[PDB]
Amino acid sequence: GSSGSSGKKNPCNAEFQNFCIHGECKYIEHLEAVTCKCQQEYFGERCGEK
């Protein structure tokens, strides 16, 4: 239809806030799945270890 962003909010800071310890979080829409990017120092899924 048309635009109309109604209340924008990501699960990265709603429910999965306690997931991405140290890293950039990006909720995937096309896949409806949340992920946690780990920097060079960090690794894994949550990216808690560096």
For the chain, breaks with the C atom over 2.5 A from the next N come after: none
Nearest to 42 by CA among 15, 24, 17: 24
Distance in Å from the first CA to the final CA of the chain:
45
Strand, coil or helix: 48: coil
Phi, psi of 16 (to 5 degrees): -90, 20
Instruction: Please state whether 44 falls in left (phi above 0), alpha (psi between -120 and 50) or beta.
Output: left
| CB-based contact 26:13 (threshold 8 Å) | no
> What's the CA gap between 23 and 10, in Å, rounded?
15
Beta bridge partners of 28: 33
**Positive or negative torsion for Cα 27, 10, 8, 39:** negative
Question: Under CATH, what is the fold of the domain 1-50?
Answer: Laminin (2.10.25)
